[PDB]
Motif scaffolding. Sequence first.
Motif, PDB file in Angstrom:
ATOM      1  N   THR B   5       0.756  -1.164   0.180  1.00  0.00           N
ATOM      2  CA  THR B   5      -0.004   0.056  -0.044  1.00  0.00           C
ATOM      3  C   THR B   5       0.901   1.268  -0.072  1.00  0.00           C
ATOM      4  N   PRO B   6       0.337   2.322  -0.965  1.00  0.00           N
ATOM      5  CA  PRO B   6       1.056   3.478  -0.927  1.00  0.00           C
ATOM      6  C   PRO B   6       0.537   4.699   0.037  1.00  0.00           C
ATOM      7  N   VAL B   7      -0.730   4.130   0.781  1.00  0.00           N
ATOM      8  CA  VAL B   7      -1.548   4.971   1.677  1.00  0.00           C
ATOM      9  C   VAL B   7      -0.894   4.756   3.150  1.00  0.00           C
ATOM     10  N   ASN B   8      -0.532   6.032   3.617  1.00  0.00           N
ATOM     11  CA  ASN B   8      -0.460   6.010   5.267  1.00  0.00           C
ATOM     12  C   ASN B   8       0.523   4.916   5.648  1.00  0.00           C
ATOM     13  N   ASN B   9       1.566   4.763   4.810  1.00  0.00           N
ATOM     14  CA  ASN B   9       2.788   3.801   5.039  1.00  0.00           C
ATOM     15  C   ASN B   9       4.078   4.150   5.238  1.00  0.00           C
ATOM     16  N   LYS B  10       4.258   5.268   6.150  1.00  0.00           N
ATOM     17  CA  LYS B  10       5.450   5.708   6.372  1.00  0.00           C
ATOM     18  C   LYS B  10       6.360   5.122   7.103  1.00  0.00           C
ATOM     19  N   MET B  11       7.749   5.235   6.856  1.00  0.00           N
ATOM     20  CA  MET B  11       8.817   4.295   7.458  1.00  0.00           C
ATOM     21  C   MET B  11       9.714   5.317   8.086  1.00  0.00           C
ATOM     22  N   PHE B  12      10.481   4.595   9.095  1.00  0.00           N
ATOM     23  CA  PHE B  12      11.384   5.513   9.911  1.00  0.00           C
ATOM     24  C   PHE B  12      12.786   5.011  10.149  1.00  0.00           C
TER      25      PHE B  12
ATOM     26  N   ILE C  39      -1.345  -5.124 -23.460  1.00  0.00           N
ATOM     27  CA  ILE C  39      -1.195  -5.503 -22.211  1.00  0.00           C
ATOM     28  C   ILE C  39      -2.193  -4.700 -21.141  1.00  0.00           C
ATOM     29  N   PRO C  40      -3.222  -5.266 -20.664  1.00  0.00           N
ATOM     30  CA  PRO C  40      -3.970  -4.528 -19.776  1.00  0.00           C
ATOM     31  C   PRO C  40      -3.312  -4.233 -18.585  1.00  0.00           C
ATOM     32  N   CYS C  41      -3.394  -3.050 -17.584  1.00  0.00           N
ATOM     33  CA  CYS C  41      -3.199  -2.775 -16.328  1.00  0.00           C
ATOM     34  C   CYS C  41      -3.733  -1.937 -15.628  1.00  0.00           C
ATOM     35  N   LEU C  42      -3.773  -1.896 -14.348  1.00  0.00           N
ATOM     36  CA  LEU C  42      -4.623  -1.075 -13.489  1.00  0.00           C
ATOM     37  C   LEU C  42      -3.556  -0.242 -12.546  1.00  0.00           C
ATOM     38  N   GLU C  43      -4.002   0.958 -12.250  1.00  0.00           N
ATOM     39  CA  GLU C  43      -3.065   1.913 -11.652  1.00  0.00           C
ATOM     40  C   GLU C  43      -4.205   2.589 -10.575  1.00  0.00           C
ATOM     41  N   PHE C  44      -3.548   3.195  -9.714  1.00  0.00           N
ATOM     42  CA  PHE C  44      -4.525   3.797  -8.585  1.00  0.00           C
ATOM     43  C   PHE C  44      -3.739   5.002  -7.841  1.00  0.00           C
ATOM     44  N   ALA C  45      -4.451   5.948  -7.300  1.00  0.00           N
ATOM     45  CA  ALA C  45      -3.762   7.006  -6.608  1.00  0.00           C
ATOM     46  C   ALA C  45      -4.902   7.715  -5.563  1.00  0.00           C
ATOM     47  N   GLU C  46      -4.548   8.134  -4.588  1.00  0.00           N
ATOM     48  CA  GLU C  46      -5.292   8.956  -3.811  1.00  0.00           C
ATOM     49  C   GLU C  46      -5.628  10.253  -4.272  1.00  0.00           C
ATOM     50  N   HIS C  47      -4.703  10.624  -5.016  1.00  0.00           N
ATOM     51  CA  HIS C  47      -4.997  12.155  -5.722  1.00  0.00           C
ATOM     52  C   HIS C  47      -4.621  12.053  -7.083  1.00  0.00           C
ATOM     53  N   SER C  48      -5.138  12.855  -7.711  1.00  0.00           N
ATOM     54  CA  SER C  48      -4.759  13.124  -9.276  1.00  0.00           C
ATOM     55  C   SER C  48      -4.599  14.585  -9.689  1.00  0.00           C
ATOM     56  N   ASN C  49      -3.131  14.910  -9.879  1.00  0.00           N
ATOM     57  CA  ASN C  49      -2.660  16.000 -10.077  1.00  0.00           C
ATOM     58  C   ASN C  49      -2.107  16.005 -11.476  1.00  0.00           C
TER      59      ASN C  49
END
Lengths: 122, 122, 122, 122, 119
Positions: B5-12, C39-49
Amino acid sequence: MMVWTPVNNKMFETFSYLPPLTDEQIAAQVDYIVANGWIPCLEFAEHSNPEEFYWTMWKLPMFGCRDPMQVLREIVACTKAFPDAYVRLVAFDNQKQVQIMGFLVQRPKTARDFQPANKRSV
Amino acid sequence: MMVWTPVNNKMFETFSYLPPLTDEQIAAQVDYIVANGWIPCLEFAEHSNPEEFYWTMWKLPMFGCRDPMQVLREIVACTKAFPDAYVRLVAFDNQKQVQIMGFLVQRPKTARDFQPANKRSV
Amino acid sequence: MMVWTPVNNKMFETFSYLPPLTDEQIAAQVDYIVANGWIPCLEFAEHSNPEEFYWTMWKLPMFGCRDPMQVLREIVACTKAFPDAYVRLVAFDNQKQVQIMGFLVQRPKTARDFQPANKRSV
Amino acid sequence: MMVWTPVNNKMFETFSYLPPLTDEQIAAQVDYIVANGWIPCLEFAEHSNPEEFYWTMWKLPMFGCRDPMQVLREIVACTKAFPDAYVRLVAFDNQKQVQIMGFLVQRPKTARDFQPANKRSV
Amino acid sequence: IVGNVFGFKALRALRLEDLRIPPAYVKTFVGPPHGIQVERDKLNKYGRGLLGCTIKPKLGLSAKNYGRAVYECLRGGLDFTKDDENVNSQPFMRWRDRFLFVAEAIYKAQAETGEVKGH
Ligand SMILES: [Mg+2]
């Protein structure tokens, strides 16, 4: 060993590391301005940032003022008109053309970004 | 296939990808510092950003300390004074003049920017 | 004369000026991918800029997939794992080594920065 | 001596230092546009920043318009469609190819970043 | 004025005590980059002496430790810290490494205290 806190411990230049100035202490500083023939002036701002050079002048510098009571009355008038602002008293020397003194006489009440003297270390 | 997951997955940094350190595990790291003759030191901060090099020193590095219990007691004292802070234990090697270990011993409780181990992939 | 609104009218590249895609319309685009050997692929994000080039890959590109049902099932799985994310279906051509198609299949529900088709002009 | 307030005292170019324009005063400005043969146009924006050159055009400039009532009706229509926006009336001179007049005819109601005329000094 | 005369056999000792630099000669010099008044204006600091501090030990600290010491010094209320006169660029600490760590320390202490800092 006490630890100097990095948390909400902002300072505001001259006298900020001392106990808060009493009315008598502020009056003594004003006497200092007058005894030395310097030009009193008041300045104020909504916010105080180290990067920000200029604040807003309260009226004009008090040229020719030799009366400490007059200065104290302008402090009252300035803080009355801007009760939530940072307000500082400064004085100018026109021979060296530089500000020769300055300290805070008011901070916003909503400010919690500084510590009382006995909470500066833990 | 599980997705990291890219979401709220910070490391230290060091040990962040392992299960949270138990008291016994922290104690074992402190034994390691002592066995190697390194200088223990505590550091703390309100926030942790990869761009920010320095944190605030808790007191001074514990020069000459050969007592793990002393180190553990300073962890307690530091976290007691700053219960909402990131706090890390580090150790210095004065021969190579470099920090030779370091890991988090506390994070803010209000932090929800990291995942528990079993929530890192979906 | 209708006026095109500048307010909360964000767009998201291919097909965003059309009515929202029905399930049948999405299934037709997937058939297009399969018919062309891409080649199909899925991508995702919290925000779109617009400034942000990369999103996060859902698993791996579906190399060798010739089954539209498989692609549709991965859409369901991706959106189930990230119900609040932007999610796009894309397809790669390995001969030209470039993305050859792509469109949104999910936006966050909390998003109010875009208009329904009949509210784009006033 | 009155002090010009730095606090929430934003201005918006031509005529902002005067009392707010009455309906009759706006109408007189429109008459001026028509008498001089200039091209009326309306523009609007969610926000007003000195750094931001362009606003959004309401429809098109009113080429060939010699009817002040037409201009006033567009002001109504523009402000009705965008009741929370800054809206300004401008006029163009196509011989010098430059905007030859302009002033605000609406500000957001939620705006508290400017002062009424009698509160500009303290 | 001091080039050769101090070595003349005919004298046993010589000391230059003072020079009168006339305005016509003074005017040929650029002089100090800023001077006292301008400096105070540039620092926005008035009404008291400025406070500084040489980092110690003189030599032997790494760049990272230099910046560490600098931050801790500045954050406590010093206006300035400084390299020791003999801290230039050396095997234990190269100058550019130091400059970068010091710049981080200045910025951190300035933000924490709300006062203008330098090194
Ligand atoms: Mg020295």
